[PDB]
């Protein structure tokens, strides 16, 4: 299913990028702002990996690189990573919908 | 309460702008894309009104005017109209969160 | 410190909004009622500025707008500005404690 | 004629002072309370202007100053500005009778 | 009541400035000439205070300053302090009418 | 003895100059502003006379002429005519004190 | 040059206000008392003209008005007209220093 | 109709922009240089307004902005504001002709 | 001058924002969609700069900030950046007309 | 070819709607603003015809009706008529590209 | 140090007066011309402030007023504000030397 | 005899009160402002003496005490010390005229 819960905002450290391999998403929290970024490389579909030390997203298939917000700056990647719809449910749980693409600037503050 | 249901997607005609006075929002449907736009003028807070013939939003207070997308072009309004988070709930009804403002180009496909 | 003096009531004009940039608060006097409003924008935390010309609060970071009482009406601000505890000390000076938030329409009559 | 319409409440911003120079009155809206104040200075009869920046009324003829409520505090003005009868008509229009002067604290809630 | 008695000429020392806080006036005696000066700052209405050593009036709100005669020289004050009507009554007591403002150069000899 | 009552403001037409020969004063009413002007010519002391047509004061002794405000403009008159203290007593009657000279711009509003 | 002669005391009539457009000052003689007053309006600097009939100074730009002593009472002028240093030279001619401003009550008797 | 008087050079402050709404022109004075600028926006013909605070011209219809000299820099305005001919009549009156458009660099020195 | 070529579509990388300082415009390519955006800040006219990492336009003068599409969100900028008419000429190279502003959502696909 | 010329701007009277059957477009002139609107009904593709008497576009197939700007308001038409790219070439004739759709608010000023 | 950097010419709007409060200077840019004006009032040394609304410099200590070019016209200020040395460094940075005063007519064009 | 010179501004240190008993005046220098104050006690005419320690003027005859500006505060002295006319002659020497008394707030800045 594209729609699913990810956890309460407390399960995510401030300034952390959490990788959900099965869900095909990153959960990026900056201060109190939350973002959901897809792991799918925009080149041919490989799974991008985040490096904490380099603070970038890197594709091991053809060397595409993305900044923390997902914008492509190196490699054959032609466009930024897809940002996904993320809401806080009525019971304090974060919900992500991979079927709903959102503009890159979208953020969820808690 | 800023969180509330708005109706099923089919209660909104294709290519129509629906004014929900009580909820102080607009529900704009273009083809199958839905947007939620606040009625509050970004100047001093008056409730703007949509003109179907002129295809623009007009404020009754000092004459600020916005395009269909919410971009301000006339009057002292310094910002575009606020776009609001709108989700499709599993019970088939559209829900709007007034407290969550979203980027201008956000859309929900059905 | 969260606790500090802001001056005597006679130092504040009737119908005035006084910005204490160091203390990061506003002192609002309407007739004989005094209010303490925090400058911290409820969006991402920037310091809002009061527009004497437009009688509203403006945040320069993302364009949030608040009414004189602190209630937001435009921009990404989700909730009204924080009102702070304000007491009249024995020595005739007004004392504000930013650590104690008070309801929106709280007021100190003198 | 001493009776005229001034518009619907939705045409007046919250916390605004509107000058109707032809009608020679002010329309003051605080929250949902409406007040009608005459522009005639109580000194020698000149037309008083409202200063949005200073939140006061000032007469250009001899320098009288009035608080936002119309009470004089500086200049040769002897008594506060006249407040006028303001009614909400059944057709949603605000009606003012400038020949009927009302007490200072009179207000119309909507 | 704006009309009130203030006292006989002998209760005010020669070359003294007497502050009537409750009456919101100054009684200035130079030799045998008496003057009644209002305490209200012509900027936004705060109560100014007289400094005998500096021989000037100072407003505690925004730093407007007035000379002994009431002429403003510092701060945003756009007008001199209001001079008030003062008479010597039948019973030898001075009466002040704050509702009657008099030109700056007015004086009462005894 | 030099203090005396002159009558109620109703006994003086608007825009009229009334000569009180036994009181050696004028009572000038413009709209609702009253002035008390001495009839003593500032040249050698003759009694000046007002012309309702020419709207000026004329001295028949040596041809000195004064404006309605008392300003000398013709003849050997060195000064303007003296303005005198005039108050509205508690019993609604106008009182003039010829022993108390006031600045030329003094006026009494009723 | 700021310093210059304006003539001998007897070249100025008693009770006269003489305008010296060449030097942009007024020479006011009341009996034997002389004053030097600048023509520059304290608002935005226009040349003020004296009306002998009204006995006031008037600015042609935005309607500021001053009394004979220079005190502002009408218009946006926030300060009285500047009074200038004036001495009686040994050779019997009056000298004015425009660069040296003096208190408003200053007078030079000859 | 296209030729009319606007007043004498003494009626315009140094470094001022004067708006003549009834005549649809601006009078700009820098030092002793006078310029006439048309208020007609070069976009679709609305009347532009001068912002004293921002030292720019603003059109309220579609948000075009012009510098003080009339050159457009923002908005759909394609060309700078029209400069109009201004002559100094030999009787001391300034005359403008809105029908005669002149280069932006032309000026009338007095 | 307002009309000029900018080059062929192949000379602009996919997902790139190229700044043409000489012509004071941006050429934005998203996939095969092209856009011409002016560099002039809609506040006071300074040249904004694009941050590839932050994916925003920033004004160096007073801190106005714009999204990739030109929508203003920070600073005193009251309107979005101007979008410009851009054509693909017959000889295969793109042409821009600075004099012709087009709606914000305009795009040229190749 | 979808890129064709239409004539000079003066070939179209002010306030006219010109239907070009062979080119499948409308040319709309309001004052000096030009628009190119496609005749294709957005329902099933019939050629829409304009009515001058009632200032609307009408599809003869199933009764779809559009406002003068192309906005659909009657019939099964789900979206407004397509607006087309229209530029003024160097040779003084307008060029239309039916293959380049533009936003509804696009206009060409001459 | 009296000599310090101010920034790049791109950081200053056209036709602007920029206040560097900590450095006690103004930076005035007209077109491509730059000038530096000291904030020290020539009266007694207080820091003057620029009024964007009135396009003048104001000193709060004794009410001195200066034109935009810095010359005094009202108040006890005896001489115009000081202009300061301003040089363009070969690394593209503007530098001001507080200790080196230059004539008002000196300008730095870029 | 009463019109005598005192010396160049060099010979008076900053913040000093120099007693000239043969000329019977004080010379007070605050920063660059000079004042000439008579030594004659307002009580009966004894020569008061300045105490650099207590920063006051004291009369040895009956205990009258003045503030540094000449304002009387102790003893039977009824009015402040006389301030005398002081001018800077073109040869760099200050000239004092004991026959010309000036307001207390008079100052001479060099
Ligand atoms: S699939 Fe990711 S870089 Fe190619
Ligand atoms: S509140 Fe909408 S234009 Fe002012
Ligand atoms: S921090 Fe205030 S609007 Fe974003
Ligand atoms: S008429 Fe208003 S102050 Fe005189
Ligand atoms: S109220 Fe007195 S200076 Fe502001
Ligand atoms: S006494 Fe009046 S003119 Fe001589
Ligand atoms: S310059 Fe004198 S009132 Fe404006
Ligand atoms: S008419 Fe001025 S911008 Fe449209
Ligand atoms: S000019 Fe761009 S923010 Fe001021
Ligand atoms: S095709 Fe036009 S109404 Fe069906
Ligand atoms: S220091 Fe500026 S006027 Fe006195
Ligand atoms: S003379 Fe000085 S106290 Fe008497």
TrEMBL record, chains A, B, C, D, E, F, G, H, I, J, K, L:
What does UniProt give as GO cellular component? membrane
**Presence of the UniProt keyword Oxidoreductase in the record:** yes
Enzyme Commission no: 1.10.99.1
Lineage, opening ranks: Bacteria, Pseudomonadati, Planctomycetota, Candidatus Brocadiia, Candidatus Brocadiales
Q: Where is the Rieske domain?
A: 3-95
Q: What protein name is recorded for this chain?
A: Similar to the Rieske Protein II of bc1 complex
- Could you say which enzyme class this protein belongs to? oxidoreductase
Which organism encodes this protein? Kuenenia stuttgartiensis
The answer to keyword Metal-binding applying to this record is yes
Q: Which UniProt keywords apply?
A: 2Fe-2S, Disulfide bond, Iron, Iron-sulfur, Membrane, Metal-binding, Oxidoreductase, Transmembrane, Transmembrane helix
Q: Name one GO molecular function term.
A: oxidoreductase activity
Instruction: Identify the cofactor(s).
Output: [2Fe-2S] cluster
């Amino acid at each position: 299913s594209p729609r699913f819960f990810v956890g309460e905002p407390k399960q995510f450290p401030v300034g952390s990028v959490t990788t959900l391999k099965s869900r095909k998403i990153f959960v990026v929290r900056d201060a109190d702002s939350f973002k959901a970024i897809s792991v799918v490389c925009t080149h041919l579909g490989c799974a991008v990996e985040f490096s904490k030390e380099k603070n970038i997203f890197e594709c091991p298939c053809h060397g595409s690189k993305y900044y923390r917000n997902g914008v492509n700056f190196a490699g054959p990647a032609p466009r930024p990573l897809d940002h996904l719809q993320m809401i806080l449910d009525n019971n304090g749980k974060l919900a992500v919908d991979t079927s709903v693409k959102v503009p890159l600037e979208t953020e969820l503050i808690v």
